[PDB]
Ligand binder design. Structure first.
Ligand SMILES: *[C@@H]1O[C@H](CO)[C@@H](O[C@@H]2O[C@H](CO)[C@@H](O[C@@H]3O[C@H](CO[C@H]4O[C@H](CO[C@H]5O[C@H](CO)[C@@H](O)[C@H](O)[C@@H]5O)[C@@H](O)[C@H](O[C@H]5O[C@H](CO)[C@@H](O)[C@H](O)[C@@H]5O[C@H]5O[C@H](CO)[C@@H](O)[C@H](O)[C@@H]5O)[C@@H]4O)[C@@H](O)[C@H](O[C@H]4O[C@H](CO)[C@@H](O)[C@H](O)[C@@H]4O)[C@@H]3O)[C@H](O)[C@H]2NC(C)=O)[C@H](O)[C@H]1NC(C)=O
Ligand SMILES: C[C@H](CCCN1CCN(C(=O)OCc2cc(Cl)cc(Cl)c2)CC1)[C@H]1CC[C@H]2[C@@H]3[C@@H](O)C[C@@H]4C[C@H](O)CC[C@]4(C)[C@H]3CC[C@]12C
Ligand SMILES: [Ca+2]
Ligand code: NA
Ligand SMILES: [Zn+2]
Ligand SMILES: [Zn+2]
Length: 775
């Protein structure tokens, strides 16, 4: 019945007994005197001159009595006003070469300071508006921005930070969602979100606790003001060695709420940012008070940005569909479409897609079946992600009908207005260090490193942010190759082939600039040398897993001759048994074919003939061949010209169950008619060159520059609303939208790239996680 001496205790009591923890308010189970004892407001949160060395009054919110320092319960400015200290902000950067902690502290603590709706460009306002944050940023380790996860909403991004996982893995696929096995819905407001069943993965505080590291309470009831959360953390830090937590979290609802009201560029934003900064300076002055301002790792992190969005920029689905009362839409900065009543019978997804596709000239959203969303969003492998999805343009809303704020967010995570912040400050972080942008999915690993914890399996690439840290507890180890390649010679005669096909050296060292890709699964496959390209031919999938080649700045683009239009040549080094045949392509009226190494970039007429081998051949829809041919004939040259040559590794992907991971044979669901030639769901390419663009690709001393994509292999170009125009109007726009990381392709292909470089392996991991966005 009473909280005396138990205020903000670090545990759950029960089973009937009343609570006094930071969550009891959300659970309607605080003792009767929680409010009176544990949430004192009397006399504000700041000592004043005439309060110094005072009568200790126990009704005060924080104290200025001489004993206060003993008890960890002074106000954060006590020593500034009374004992003549300066604010932490008014001190110089001083490098923290080691953690200066008091005796007993077995590790540097971590405090995560999470700000909601914090746009990366808010940092331009600087010390004029935010002195404390501008100090953390400048003195510590900072990125120009940090990419959130899609959808760029709060709960998916906050729980991605906590777990290292994509929203499709951790289960919090939106702020609002429906689960068809639970037959229940999750919303920001409601009791359903308290069920543990909605939250998967392993958040940081569980990884801490399971490995005997004490986790400071990680959620805050909204009735608890910010100055109090900050005093409670400081008080938890003053506890004995055997009771003290080593990891803490603070969360601010700003500047998101203000961001919605007035937009991200409104002059009103200044007061919310000043407020957050003063909160930060209470934390830093409190830490300095406890002599932990050079002991503690502080992470200043945001969940997403904020965009200009007004209600006059809305699209209504009732201008496109007729029976809008037969569906439920999740509206706003994304769309998710489902039947209203599951007992509909004639509810057809196919019809809905058709009706929403390329209707208006100014159309500000695009429909997708979820498996056809760009793979970089990794937003499909969850039963809570509705099959029909709407990618909404920046600055726009989507609603169901017209009878259903100047700022919003939720759009595609590459959009510049959705980018958010990262600062790391403290001993373990580096000093006055800029680092390149990175994805919030990586941080879980860093936070485990900072706490000496073994991360749970996650979507970060462990080691990929070692360059943020003064001291790494983790050195990445390159994985072991599983299947060694065959190098089969000439083993069959040309008359031994009837596949129904008609027609009429320093190869390793100039076509695999960065070593041979390692195959990390059990399979049989052949390496095949040619003058112009090298490939890893799969005998199970009857096509290359990868195909690698290099083009100089000065190299020639030629056409395909007319007499070799339908030329496909049988490959003597591979048995007919493990070869594709040209008959199935005849029998298959929808499927045609393309080539991985382009015949358009043959070094000579003689060399060109290797491009028409059966072992360079891949199943391709005529629709897709328009995309692929324009890439090969024009863009591969274009990129070679601009980047002083380029290396290119192209290949197929199979992902029919849309889990972002390499399909096994069992999981392949489409073959070329009357055959066992499997149809790729996507085609990838990894295009590398020298970052120092003065040096050419095959002679690069310095760092490496990469771009990649994963083009979806579709029988139409309905995704591209300008597809009926000439390829130069739409293909490169299609490709850029499906830009990808090297890492995404490795998940999808079970291969490992960049094994033979002169660069450190942690630097390669950064290169593999890098995403070209075109902003
Ligand atoms: C991103 O990283 C993650 C993590 O590395 C990758 O996802 C992981 O993918 C694995 C391979 O597909 C899955 O393995 C399968 O697990 C089945 C059992 O599932 C339950 O246990 C899981 C294990 O959990 C451990 O790890 C977490 C780490 O956070 C800890 O918290 C735990 O303590 C455990 O140590 C658990 O993850 C599963 O959780 C899923 O389901 C529950 C609901 O039941 C949800 O609450 C979760 O959000 C989560 O849902 C996701 O994952 C499932 C698939 O499991 C999808 O269906 C959902 O759509 C959603 O995405 C479960 O509680 C195994 O039985 C299964 O075995 C198969 O394969 C073996 C051989 O290997 C065969 O023998 C079997 O016959 C069988 O077919 C398989 O091992 C992991 O579950 C999954 N983990 C997570 C956290 O998502 C992901 O691919 C990465 N993404 C990319 C792009 O690389
Ligand atoms: C969603 C519920 C609270 C909603 C309001 N909160 C406002 C303050 N807030 C916050 O403090 O954020 C800190 C933070 C920072 C980062 Cl970087 C990352 C994260 Cl994830 C958070 C942000 C929001 C909360 C209240 C109670 C929560 C449940 C727990 O009582 C019990 C469980 C504990 C498990 O570890 C996870 C699952 C579960 C059910 C908790 C889920 C979230 C609940 C319901
Ligand atoms: Ca798969
Ligand atoms: Na055909
Ligand atoms: Zn948010
Ligand atoms: Zn918001």
């Amino acid at each position: 019945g009473s909280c005396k001496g138990r205020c903000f205790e670090l545990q759950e009591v029960g089973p009937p007994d009343c609570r006094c923890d930071n969550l009891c308010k959300s659970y309607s189970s605080c003792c009767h005197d929680f409010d009176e004892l544990c949430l004192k407001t009397a006399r504000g949160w700041e000592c004043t001159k005439d309060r110094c060395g005072e009568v200790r009054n126990e009704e005060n919110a924080c104290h200025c009595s001489e004993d206060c320092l003993s008890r960890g319960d002074c106000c954060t400015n006590y020593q500034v006003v009374c004992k003549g200290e300066s604010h932490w902000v008014d001190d110089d950067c001083e490098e923290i070469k080691v953690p200066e902690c008091p005796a007993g502290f077995v590790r540097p603590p971590l405090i995560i300071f999470s700000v909601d709706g914090f746009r990366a460009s808010y940092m331009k306002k600087g010390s004029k508006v935010m002195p404390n944050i501008e100090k953390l940023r400048s003195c510590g380790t900072h990125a120009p921005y940090m990419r959130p996860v899609y959808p760029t909403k709060t709960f998916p991004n906050l729980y991605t930070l906590a777990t290292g996982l994509y929203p499709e893995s951790h289960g919090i696929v939106g702020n609002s969602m429906y689960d068809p096995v639970f037959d229940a819905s999750f919303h920001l407001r409601g009791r359903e979100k308290f069920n543990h069943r909605w939250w998967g993965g392993q958040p940081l505080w569980i990884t801490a606790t399971k490995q005997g590291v004490r986790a400071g309470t990680f959620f805050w009831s909204v009735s608890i003001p910010h100055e109090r959360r900050i005093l409670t953390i400081l008080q938890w830090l003053s506890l004995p060695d055997n009771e003290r937590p080593s990891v803490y979290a603070f969360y601010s609802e700003q500047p998101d709420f203000s961001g919605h009201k007035y937009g991200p560029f409104g002059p009103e934003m200044t007061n919310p940012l000043r407020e957050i900064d003063k909160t930060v300076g209470q934390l830093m002055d409190g830490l300095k008070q406890l002599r932990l301002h050079r002991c503690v790792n502080v992470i200043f992190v945001g969940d997403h940005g904020m965009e200009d969005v007004t209600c006059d920029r809305t699209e209504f689905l009732s201008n496109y569909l007729t029976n809008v009362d037969d569906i439920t839409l999740v509206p706003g900065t994304l769309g998710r479409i489902r039947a209203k009543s599951i007992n509909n019978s004639k509810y057809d997804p196919k019809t809905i897609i058709a009706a929403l596709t390329c209707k208006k000239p100014d159309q500000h959203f695009k429909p997708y079946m979820k498996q056809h969303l760009p793979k970089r969003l990794h937003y499909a492998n969850n039963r809570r992600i509705e099959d029909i999805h709407l990618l909404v343009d920046r600055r726009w809303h989507v609603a169901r009908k017209p009878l259903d704020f100047q700022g919003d967010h939720g759009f595609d995570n590459k959009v510049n207005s959705m980018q958010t912040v990262f600062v790391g400050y403290g001993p373990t972080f580096k000093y006055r260090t800029k680092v390149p942008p990175f994805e919030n999915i990586e941080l879980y690993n860093v936070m485990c490193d900072l706490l000496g914890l073994k991360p749970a399996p996650n979507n970060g690439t462990h080691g990929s942010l070692n360059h943020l840290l003064r001291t790494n507890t983790f050195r990445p180890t390159m994985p072991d190759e599983v299947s060694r390649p065959n190098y089969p010679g000439i083993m069959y005669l040309q008359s031994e082939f009837d596949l129904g096909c008609t027609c009429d050296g320093s190869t390793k060292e100039r076509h695999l600039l960065y070593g041979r890709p390692a195959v990390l699964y059990r399979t049989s496959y052949d390496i095949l040398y040619h003058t112009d390209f090298e490939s890893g031919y799969s005998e199970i999938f009857l096509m290359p897993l990868w195909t690698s080649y290099t083009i100089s700045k000065q190299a020639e683009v030629s056409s395909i001759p007319e007499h070799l239009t339908n030329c496909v040549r049988p490959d003597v080094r591979v048995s007919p048994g493990f070869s594709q045949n040209c008959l199935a392509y005849k029998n298959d009226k929808q499927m045609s074919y393309g080539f991985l190494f382009p015949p358009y970039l043959s070094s000579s007429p003689e060399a060109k003939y290797d491009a028409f081998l059966v072992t360079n051949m891949v199943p391709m829809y005529p629709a897709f061949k328009r995309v692929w041919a324009y890439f090969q004939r024009v863009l591969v040259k274009k990129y070679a010209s601009e980047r002083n040559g380029v290396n290119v590794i192209s290949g197929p992907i199979f992902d029919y169950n849309y889990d972002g991971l390499r399909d096994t044979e069992d999981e392949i669901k489409q073959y070329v008619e009357g055959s066992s030639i499997p149809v790729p769901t996507h085609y990838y390419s990894i295009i590398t060159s020298c970052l120092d663009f003065t040096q050419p690709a095959d002679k690069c001393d310095g760092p490496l520059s990469v771009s990649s994509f994963i083009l979806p292999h579709r029988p139409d170009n309905d995704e591209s609303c300008a597809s009926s125009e000439d390829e130069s109007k739409w293909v490169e726009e299609l490709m850029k939208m499906h830009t990808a990381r090297v890492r995404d392709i490795e998940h999808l292909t079970g291969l490992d790239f960049y094994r033979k470089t002169s660069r450190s392996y942690s630097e390669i991991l950064t290169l593999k996680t890098y995403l070209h966005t075109y902003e």
